[PDB]
JSON list of C-alpha atoms in Angstrom, two decimals:
[
{"chain": "A", "resi": 1, "resn": "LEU", "atom": "CA", "xyz": [-25.61, 205.87, 97.48]},
{"chain": "A", "resi": 2, "resn": "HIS", "atom": "CA", "xyz": [-21.90, 206.68, 97.74]},
{"chain": "A", "resi": 3, "resn": "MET", "atom": "CA", "xyz": [-21.27, 203.28, 96.14]},
{"chain": "A", "resi": 4, "resn": "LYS", "atom": "CA", "xyz": [-23.63, 204.45, 93.39]},
{"chain": "A", "resi": 5, "resn": "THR", "atom": "CA", "xyz": [-22.14, 207.96, 93.10]},
{"chain": "A", "resi": 6, "resn": "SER", "atom": "CA", "xyz": [-18.41, 207.68, 93.94]},
{"chain": "A", "resi": 7, "resn": "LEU", "atom": "CA", "xyz": [-17.62, 205.63, 90.82]},
{"chain": "A", "resi": 8, "resn": "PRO", "atom": "CA", "xyz": [-14.05, 206.14, 89.56]},
{"chain": "A", "resi": 9, "resn": "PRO", "atom": "CA", "xyz": [-13.58, 208.40, 86.52]},
{"chain": "A", "resi": 10, "resn": "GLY", "atom": "CA", "xyz": [-13.77, 206.93, 83.05]},
{"chain": "A", "resi": 11, "resn": "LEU", "atom": "CA", "xyz": [-15.73, 204.00, 81.69]},
{"chain": "A", "resi": 12, "resn": "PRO", "atom": "CA", "xyz": [-15.91, 201.00, 84.08]},
{"chain": "A", "resi": 13, "resn": "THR", "atom": "CA", "xyz": [-13.59, 198.00, 84.31]},
{"chain": "A", "resi": 14, "resn": "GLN", "atom": "CA", "xyz": [-15.72, 195.57, 82.30]},
{"chain": "A", "resi": 15, "resn": "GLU", "atom": "CA", "xyz": [-15.85, 198.18, 79.53]},
{"chain": "A", "resi": 16, "resn": "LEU", "atom": "CA", "xyz": [-12.20, 199.08, 80.16]},
{"chain": "A", "resi": 17, "resn": "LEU", "atom": "CA", "xyz": [-11.30, 195.51, 79.16]},
{"chain": "A", "resi": 18, "resn": "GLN", "atom": "CA", "xyz": [-12.36, 195.98, 75.54]},
{"chain": "A", "resi": 19, "resn": "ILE", "atom": "CA", "xyz": [-11.15, 199.60, 75.71]},
{"chain": "A", "resi": 20, "resn": "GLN", "atom": "CA", "xyz": [-7.61, 198.44, 76.48]},
{"chain": "A", "resi": 21, "resn": "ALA", "atom": "CA", "xyz": [-7.97, 195.55, 74.02]},
{"chain": "A", "resi": 22, "resn": "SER", "atom": "CA", "xyz": [-8.84, 197.97, 71.21]},
{"chain": "A", "resi": 23, "resn": "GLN", "atom": "CA", "xyz": [-6.13, 200.48, 72.15]},
{"chain": "A", "resi": 24, "resn": "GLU", "atom": "CA", "xyz": [-3.39, 197.87, 72.49]},
{"chain": "A", "resi": 25, "resn": "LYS", "atom": "CA", "xyz": [-4.46, 196.09, 69.30]},
{"chain": "A", "resi": 26, "resn": "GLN", "atom": "CA", "xyz": [-4.39, 199.32, 67.27]},
{"chain": "A", "resi": 27, "resn": "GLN", "atom": "CA", "xyz": [-1.05, 200.22, 68.88]},
{"chain": "A", "resi": 28, "resn": "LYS", "atom": "CA", "xyz": [0.31, 196.82, 67.84]},
{"chain": "A", "resi": 29, "resn": "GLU", "atom": "CA", "xyz": [-1.24, 196.91, 64.35]},
{"chain": "A", "resi": 30, "resn": "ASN", "atom": "CA", "xyz": [0.17, 200.37, 63.60]},
{"chain": "A", "resi": 31, "resn": "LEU", "atom": "CA", "xyz": [3.72, 199.33, 64.51]},
{"chain": "A", "resi": 32, "resn": "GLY", "atom": "CA", "xyz": [4.45, 195.59, 64.27]},
{"chain": "A", "resi": 33, "resn": "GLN", "atom": "CA", "xyz": [3.96, 195.32, 60.51]},
{"chain": "A", "resi": 34, "resn": "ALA", "atom": "CA", "xyz": [6.15, 198.41, 60.11]},
{"chain": "A", "resi": 35, "resn": "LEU", "atom": "CA", "xyz": [8.81, 196.66, 62.22]},
{"chain": "A", "resi": 36, "resn": "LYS", "atom": "CA", "xyz": [8.53, 193.55, 60.03]},
{"chain": "A", "resi": 37, "resn": "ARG", "atom": "CA", "xyz": [8.94, 195.64, 56.87]},
{"chain": "A", "resi": 38, "resn": "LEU", "atom": "CA", "xyz": [11.92, 197.42, 58.45]},
{"chain": "A", "resi": 39, "resn": "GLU", "atom": "CA", "xyz": [13.48, 194.06, 59.33]},
{"chain": "A", "resi": 40, "resn": "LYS", "atom": "CA", "xyz": [12.91, 192.82, 55.76]},
{"chain": "A", "resi": 41, "resn": "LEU", "atom": "CA", "xyz": [14.72, 195.90, 54.42]},
{"chain": "A", "resi": 42, "resn": "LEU", "atom": "CA", "xyz": [17.45, 195.45, 57.04]},
{"chain": "A", "resi": 43, "resn": "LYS", "atom": "CA", "xyz": [18.04, 191.80, 56.12]},
{"chain": "A", "resi": 44, "resn": "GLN", "atom": "CA", "xyz": [18.07, 192.85, 52.47]},
{"chain": "A", "resi": 45, "resn": "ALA", "atom": "CA", "xyz": [20.90, 195.19, 53.48]},
{"chain": "A", "resi": 46, "resn": "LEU", "atom": "CA", "xyz": [22.48, 192.28, 55.38]},
{"chain": "A", "resi": 47, "resn": "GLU", "atom": "CA", "xyz": [22.53, 190.07, 52.29]},
{"chain": "A", "resi": 48, "resn": "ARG", "atom": "CA", "xyz": [23.81, 193.02, 50.24]},
{"chain": "A", "resi": 49, "resn": "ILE", "atom": "CA", "xyz": [26.73, 193.35, 52.69]},
{"chain": "B", "resi": 1, "resn": "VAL", "atom": "CA", "xyz": [-28.56, 179.41, 138.93]},
{"chain": "B", "resi": 2, "resn": "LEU", "atom": "CA", "xyz": [-31.48, 180.78, 136.91]},
{"chain": "B", "resi": 3, "resn": "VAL", "atom": "CA", "xyz": [-30.23, 184.38, 137.28]},
{"chain": "B", "resi": 4, "resn": "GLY", "atom": "CA", "xyz": [-26.90, 183.21, 135.84]},
{"chain": "B", "resi": 5, "resn": "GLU", "atom": "CA", "xyz": [-28.74, 181.36, 133.06]},
{"chain": "B", "resi": 6, "resn": "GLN", "atom": "CA", "xyz": [-30.77, 184.47, 132.19]},
{"chain": "B", "resi": 7, "resn": "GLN", "atom": "CA", "xyz": [-27.68, 186.71, 132.27]},
{"chain": "B", "resi": 8, "resn": "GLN", "atom": "CA", "xyz": [-25.68, 184.39, 130.01]},
{"chain": "B", "resi": 9, "resn": "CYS", "atom": "CA", "xyz": [-28.72, 184.11, 127.72]},
{"chain": "B", "resi": 10, "resn": "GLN", "atom": "CA", "xyz": [-29.08, 187.89, 127.39]},
{"chain": "B", "resi": 11, "resn": "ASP", "atom": "CA", "xyz": [-25.32, 188.47, 127.04]},
{"chain": "B", "resi": 12, "resn": "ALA", "atom": "CA", "xyz": [-25.13, 187.09, 123.49]},
{"chain": "B", "resi": 13, "resn": "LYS", "atom": "CA", "xyz": [-28.16, 189.08, 122.30]},
{"chain": "B", "resi": 14, "resn": "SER", "atom": "CA", "xyz": [-26.72, 192.27, 123.79]},
{"chain": "B", "resi": 15, "resn": "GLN", "atom": "CA", "xyz": [-23.32, 191.34, 122.31]},
{"chain": "B", "resi": 16, "resn": "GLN", "atom": "CA", "xyz": [-24.31, 190.67, 118.68]},
{"chain": "B", "resi": 17, "resn": "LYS", "atom": "CA", "xyz": [-25.06, 194.33, 117.84]},
{"chain": "B", "resi": 18, "resn": "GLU", "atom": "CA", "xyz": [-21.45, 195.49, 118.09]},
{"chain": "B", "resi": 19, "resn": "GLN", "atom": "CA", "xyz": [-20.13, 192.67, 115.88]},
{"chain": "B", "resi": 20, "resn": "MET", "atom": "CA", "xyz": [-22.90, 193.54, 113.40]},
{"chain": "B", "resi": 21, "resn": "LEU", "atom": "CA", "xyz": [-21.67, 197.15, 113.38]},
{"chain": "B", "resi": 22, "resn": "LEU", "atom": "CA", "xyz": [-18.06, 195.90, 113.19]},
{"chain": "B", "resi": 23, "resn": "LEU", "atom": "CA", "xyz": [-18.70, 193.74, 110.12]},
{"chain": "B", "resi": 24, "resn": "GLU", "atom": "CA", "xyz": [-20.72, 196.56, 108.54]},
{"chain": "B", "resi": 25, "resn": "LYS", "atom": "CA", "xyz": [-17.97, 199.14, 109.00]},
{"chain": "B", "resi": 26, "resn": "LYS", "atom": "CA", "xyz": [-15.24, 196.76, 107.83]},
{"chain": "B", "resi": 27, "resn": "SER", "atom": "CA", "xyz": [-17.47, 195.94, 104.85]},
{"chain": "B", "resi": 28, "resn": "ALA", "atom": "CA", "xyz": [-17.59, 199.65, 104.03]},
{"chain": "B", "resi": 29, "resn": "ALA", "atom": "CA", "xyz": [-13.83, 199.93, 104.58]},
{"chain": "B", "resi": 30, "resn": "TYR", "atom": "CA", "xyz": [-13.39, 197.14, 102.04]},
{"chain": "B", "resi": 31, "resn": "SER", "atom": "CA", "xyz": [-15.46, 199.22, 99.60]},
{"chain": "B", "resi": 32, "resn": "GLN", "atom": "CA", "xyz": [-13.20, 202.22, 100.19]},
{"chain": "B", "resi": 33, "resn": "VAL", "atom": "CA", "xyz": [-10.07, 200.10, 99.64]},
{"chain": "B", "resi": 34, "resn": "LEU", "atom": "CA", "xyz": [-11.59, 198.63, 96.45]},
{"chain": "B", "resi": 35, "resn": "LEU", "atom": "CA", "xyz": [-12.44, 202.13, 95.20]},
{"chain": "B", "resi": 36, "resn": "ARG", "atom": "CA", "xyz": [-8.85, 203.25, 95.80]},
{"chain": "B", "resi": 37, "resn": "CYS", "atom": "CA", "xyz": [-7.56, 200.15, 93.99]},
{"chain": "B", "resi": 38, "resn": "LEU", "atom": "CA", "xyz": [-9.94, 200.82, 91.08]},
{"chain": "B", "resi": 39, "resn": "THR", "atom": "CA", "xyz": [-8.67, 204.40, 90.80]},
{"chain": "B", "resi": 40, "resn": "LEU", "atom": "CA", "xyz": [-5.02, 203.30, 90.90]},
{"chain": "B", "resi": 41, "resn": "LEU", "atom": "CA", "xyz": [-5.61, 200.52, 88.36]},
{"chain": "B", "resi": 42, "resn": "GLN", "atom": "CA", "xyz": [-7.45, 202.81, 85.94]},
{"chain": "B", "resi": 43, "resn": "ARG", "atom": "CA", "xyz": [-4.57, 205.27, 86.32]},
{"chain": "B", "resi": 44, "resn": "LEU", "atom": "CA", "xyz": [-2.12, 202.45, 85.54]},
{"chain": "B", "resi": 45, "resn": "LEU", "atom": "CA", "xyz": [-4.07, 201.24, 82.50]},
{"chain": "B", "resi": 46, "resn": "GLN", "atom": "CA", "xyz": [-5.38, 204.42, 80.87]},
{"chain": "B", "resi": 47, "resn": "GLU", "atom": "CA", "xyz": [-2.82, 207.07, 81.84]},
{"chain": "B", "resi": 48, "resn": "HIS", "atom": "CA", "xyz": [0.33, 204.95, 82.06]},
{"chain": "B", "resi": 49, "resn": "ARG", "atom": "CA", "xyz": [-0.31, 202.26, 79.42]},
{"chain": "B", "resi": 50, "resn": "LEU", "atom": "CA", "xyz": [-3.20, 203.07, 77.08]},
{"chain": "B", "resi": 51, "resn": "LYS", "atom": "CA", "xyz": [-2.51, 206.71, 76.15]},
{"chain": "B", "resi": 52, "resn": "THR", "atom": "CA", "xyz": [1.10, 207.59, 77.00]},
{"chain": "B", "resi": 53, "resn": "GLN", "atom": "CA", "xyz": [2.75, 204.24, 76.25]}
]
């Protein structure tokens, strides 16, 4: 019953897999395209040098 | 000879209980270690990587 009641806090590991997949994919999607746009502007500045 | 045979026969049956308890308690100790690992890994994923990072 301890093994049925002493579960660690938060949603379990098999659910934590898609939890971390969703969180890391939204973290990447919010930032990587912004980095690409920044690099495009920066290389525009490089060719304007 | 037959007293020795009977004693050696009963020795294993009297023995097996303590290895049964030994494997049971080490099996529960494995569950405790796995629970501690699960807590540490969920701390590493959620607290250290998912939310803060």
